[PDB]
Amino acid sequence: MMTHEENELLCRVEGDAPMGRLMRRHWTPICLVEEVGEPDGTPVKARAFGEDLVVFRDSEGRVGVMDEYCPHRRASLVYGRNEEGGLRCLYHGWKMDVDGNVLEMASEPSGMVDKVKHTAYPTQEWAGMVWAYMGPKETMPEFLPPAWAPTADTRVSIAKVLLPCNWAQILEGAIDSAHSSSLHSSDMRPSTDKAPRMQVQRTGYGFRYAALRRPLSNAAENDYVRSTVFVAPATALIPPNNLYNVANINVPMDDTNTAFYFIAWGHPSQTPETETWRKFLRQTVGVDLDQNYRPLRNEANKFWQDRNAMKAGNFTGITGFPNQDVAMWLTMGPIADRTHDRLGASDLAIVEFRKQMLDAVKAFEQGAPAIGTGVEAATPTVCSFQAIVPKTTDWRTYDAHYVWL
Amino acid sequence: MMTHEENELLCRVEGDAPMGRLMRRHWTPICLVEEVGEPDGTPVKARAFGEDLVVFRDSEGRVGVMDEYCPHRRASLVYGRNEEGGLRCLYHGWKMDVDGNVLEMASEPGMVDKVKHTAYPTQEWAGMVWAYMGPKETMPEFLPPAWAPTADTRVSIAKVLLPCNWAQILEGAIDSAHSSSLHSSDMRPSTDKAPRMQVQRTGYGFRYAALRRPLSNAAENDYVRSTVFVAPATALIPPNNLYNVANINVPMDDTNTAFYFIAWGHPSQTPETETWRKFLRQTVGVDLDQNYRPLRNEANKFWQDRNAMKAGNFTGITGFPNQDVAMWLTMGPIADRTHDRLGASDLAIVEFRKQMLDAVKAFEQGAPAIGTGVEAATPTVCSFQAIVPKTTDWRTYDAHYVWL
Amino acid sequence: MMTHEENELLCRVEGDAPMGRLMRRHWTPICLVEEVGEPDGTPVKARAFGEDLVVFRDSEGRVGVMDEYCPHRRASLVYGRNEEGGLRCLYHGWKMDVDGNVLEMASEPAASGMVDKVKHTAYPTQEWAGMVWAYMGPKETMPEFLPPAWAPTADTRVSIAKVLLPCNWAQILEGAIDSAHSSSLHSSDMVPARVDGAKATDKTWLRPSTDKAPRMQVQRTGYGFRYAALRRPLSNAAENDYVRSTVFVAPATALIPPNNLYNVANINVPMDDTNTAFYFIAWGHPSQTPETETWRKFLRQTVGVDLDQNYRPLRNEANKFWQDRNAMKAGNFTGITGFPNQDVAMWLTMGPIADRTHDRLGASDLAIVEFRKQMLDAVKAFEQGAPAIGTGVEAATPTVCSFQAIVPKTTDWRTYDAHYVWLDG
Amino acid sequence: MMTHEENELLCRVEGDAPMGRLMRRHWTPICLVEEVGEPDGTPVKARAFGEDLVVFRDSEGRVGVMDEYCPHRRASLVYGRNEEGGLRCLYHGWKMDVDGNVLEMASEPAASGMVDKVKHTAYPTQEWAGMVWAYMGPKETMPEFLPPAWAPTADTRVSIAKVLLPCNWAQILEGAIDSAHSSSLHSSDMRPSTDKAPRMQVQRTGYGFRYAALRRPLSNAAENDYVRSTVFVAPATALIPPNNLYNVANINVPMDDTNTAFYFIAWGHPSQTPETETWRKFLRQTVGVDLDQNYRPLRNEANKFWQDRNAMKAGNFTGITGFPNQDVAMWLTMGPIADRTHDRLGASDLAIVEFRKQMLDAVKAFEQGAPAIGTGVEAATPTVCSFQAIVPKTTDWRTYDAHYVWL
């Protein structure tokens, strides 16, 4: 059981909310590189921890991420002119650089120019995404390759969808092996075991766990191990396939919205391209998603669930495996009332995720280094994996690296 | 630097909100005359200071302005039948006249005489239906507004129902700095984009100048553009060589506003309604919907053309008012002035800020609300623009409104 | 100078039109292998040479291509039930197989020989290079299915963009044998640089020249012709020529100059006199060639954004192919997006069948004039017993191929010994 | 086998076509009563045999049917003012009455004798079982209007579904007189049998032909057959084997060479026969869901008649909903005039062959001065009906004494 209290604590990220402050202790993806386009390109809107952000790429190709509302009278910078090494607001011609310095003010003589600085965040570009450090400046750590993007020879293919529900349930969905055998029946293996035994192993960055199913052959002394990795506060590394690995990173746009990024990543000639990935997942922009990466599926059209399809044997009658997830997640409401839950042994990873985060948030709201920073970070040596193993090797012992070649 | 409380005091108008009661002391435009139509024409729904209203023209051709909801069981009168000197509710057949007197009650037999429905005194003028919405015994006699001398003048109005609070919209009216950037590609013999700002308080608001350096002779000359603020939310805008310009805003509620943009002057030099609308791109059925709501909106980024912008045009948006609309709206439903960062160009905005708070505070504690009485403006108050010698004061400049 | 006759002859394929009969001597791409889907999958409608076709994959996973209309009372088969080794009509239960045998008639007392006497027009089908092919010539004129010049064998990635263009085939192909246009029409797409090839990243194809007026040369051959466009390069055009060799494989295949990583082809299949299946292909090594979806997004021939369910283009004359007039003021040359979409806007506005009578060609057009002579010759010879052009021992194969290079002026482009871009080659 | 010539003759009805002249000898449904509305009600466009038509009910409530273009300068009368006992053209105010008399010309000093001088093409009309009928053949060949075989008298409920179909009339009737199809196409809708292969018989009459479909009954198959009897009343009526509670009827009127108005009727005792709206919902031929304002269907070739491919994989045979639409799909996809020349028929089409032969003869006969099939002494009467029962093979089905389902 959790309390309406702890639900609030684990879930809210807007404003003062602890989990928010804690989260901003990490680098965050603000948006996709493909959105910001060429030098001097169209400014893009984005949103993290309930703060509206412009992202533009100035003429020097530097990417800037700032408070959307211009420092003068609070008009939007998204309508601005990106040229000549700066974003210039439409109303009264103030022009900020990616750093947030105001280079000019077409309407003003004195020296207000030097002495006004606009909320701008240090940015970093990696693995097809635009990252920003959204917590206190002199706490920003240097940028390390995240677990699912070792270095820049790796192919990283991103699906992005802006989902209208709180982040926590979207992740709870990722560390739940039981469900692929149920939701993803008709989509997703050497085993037909529907009830996996679950084992956890706490770590410095989050945790590891295993789904132990009875394999199709020699269920006698063999186990089929599928092992997911939760990297706090909002990453999951999903059990890989024959050829590439799969990761989920979720960025809370606010209390009830979350940017959801589902990644394929491996050796470039074993890994799908971006546009292939999305077609598979049915998150293709303009067929599946609007121009903002908002799903055309929703409660109204019952996520295009096809009832005939279902009677024909197709399990969910919803096409694209994440869309199937979406259907479930979003019907749990804005913020899922964990208060009303009725968990079983299958939700072991889930109960770890709540315990761990509730832990690392109160701790943090009290002066502990926030879970997963400093000496402790996960790196590209931690990774999910799936194999068949003897019942007599520990799965934690298994010496797996991320799939490649 | 303003407090949150002041912004709330300056800005709110629904219910008892002081700025509300203050405004209701002036005559207020409720809607356009075009909307009301012929005698016995279709009822119009309109909204002022967070109160819903019917407007209908009866058989005699009297226009009324009443509470939208029937005095029986609060059904919408907008659905009623406007005929034979009354508006009759569909439901039970009660029939009010423009004055709010209940003439009949189809479904009942001395009640018909002793029930009044809220109606306000009304006046047509300059193509608008005006009402008085303050206490009945405070109603002035209707004087011409400073932008409609008498109705041999041509008054061509664009209306747009903007979904944001009233004040930020006027704030944009009194801001001569903005057109030097925003209306970069629409707007004058100068390119001084940073003009010295001068102000002069009055009994009815303020006059103010914007002192640009002219294309030639900015040794002993200033190009001066002067703008007049009539409280509570009216602004006389520097005219051009042919006709003058005015903006009056009526708060619909705390987060919405009727925005009337007016060209005015002599009928042979002032453009016609539809020409105006087409110019400012505020045409019903292309730029706006049947209720004068803009089809442009944040969802569609006001139809900004990003290529147009790479091709020289500053804003990418078409129709100088919509480029205004973009800014006003993006600041949010009520602009949080708390978080502002004003400069020398915003001197005019500050004056309004400061004057109106004085006025509302003064009024709240029982002063006559600013603009009433002896203190009124009338047609001789006006904006102007000319090249003025540096050795003359502009407050001195003796200018009347463009005509012939 | 061409004549109303010669045009009609060159262009029409419906009916007993010879250019039709000639064409049917080749294997024809009927539709995309992706359209037919799974065994017992929904049946696809298609159209070649003025004939309606059902294509389906049976329960054994065989692909049949047949006449669309049911042998019985001519109802559409595309509505029928594909199951248990056949396609069955909804009306009277007749069930054909991939071959054209009516294996059942549910209405008809099977106590008579009605079922074995009825044969329904089908064609021998083949699957290859991501496409379903059929032989729509006379039955025992059918050659063993040879690897096409742009799909060597099956270790090769082949990414296809399909677009059903609503004009005649011949203008579309004329488009592919025309190096001059790319320097005018595809100004803002094939942007000149200090390179040697034309990489991209959905960035741009490059090209080491800015010469818009290339010297043209031709070489007739058994299967059609090759030609070269000779551009002065940016650097040392003294004794160097940037060669770009396009190959025409008759009747309607264009081998287009490769870039750095992969090769480019075009194959057009006339649906009828005034419409044309246009397939535009990237092909080469699996790890250097774009995946299907990636290709389409670059070309803006994505189904459900650029094209509709049936691979028909959403851009048309009405919407002026989405011509962004602003973009044109701001620099982008055509103001239309996805470079084959630029081609289309032209080909289309020349009308259902270009009236080649009123043309006014230059030395830019030398390659097109070459296609016009050849095809009119080969069709005339064919109408008089001559083995249809590019069949038998005379066919192209995977050793014919386009190429680009800077070559010294004192080598003959015909002499250059090139192979299709692979990984090293 | 049939010939391009004959097909033409069977099918075309516009202009001078012989099948046109023959058809114009019978009373014709022009459109539903439900359309012409109250007196002074909005004028209705309609189209029979390639002639455009205005229908309107005047102040007295008489229903006129006229040529659509105003007699003056040929503007549409469908835009006209229907009041004060006349339809008045909007242009120059010429006003006609149902009978095609011009009562005034609002811009002419009509005080003399070129206001009566002008009649306007207008046909005699009758209201009956939900339908405005007109006789559009030559004046003096009009037979006094006898009750058709599916509406015995106006104490019957007659529930109609109308559908404007974009193909020639003939393939739409062929569809009605073809029992072979109900046990294949309508397999998941449509009986004490599972037999799909039934021995047909045909008997010609003066009005058309009767025939019997014979299925072996699910039980006692040795000396009993389940008889389904359909009656073709020419030119394009079909009486279709009834059910337990009501009878069925198809009449098709050619709008022209490549379109038909398809009227499909439920009829019987008022308390055993569906209401209009029920029928339409059952057949999915409801105006405003399935059909547009003009009874034109929203399912078409472009949207594959809403064929649900999954539903089919699920085992519902056609994956099209409402059994008439299963039919439409087939008929249309054959194309505007089925080229009967590429037909390859079998035993199951025995009836359709009868239809072909009869009509081809009856029109060559008509063209050479014989009476038009099933007119005068020859006509069908409400004594003619479709029937189905289980009968011994030792009664002649032709002889069976069945009457129309009622109670």
Ligand SMILES: O=C(O)c1ccc(C(=O)O)cc1
């Ligand atoms: O038909 C086409 O789309 C096409 C033809 C030629 C070339 C070229 O030679 O670069 C490119 C594209």
Ligand code: FES
């Ligand atoms: S508000 Fe952005 S410059 Fe004035």
Ligand code: FES
């Ligand atoms: S509420 Fe309007 S009369 Fe009853």
Ligand code: FES
């Ligand atoms: S037409 Fe296909 S079986 Fe009757």
Ligand code: FES
């Ligand atoms: S055409 Fe009808 S009256 Fe002139």
Ligand SMILES: [Fe+2]
């Ligand atoms: Fe999932």
Ligand SMILES: [Fe+2]
């Ligand atoms: Fe403005």
Ligand SMILES: [Fe+2]
């Ligand atoms: Fe091209």
Ligand SMILES: [Fe+2]
């Ligand atoms: Fe049927």
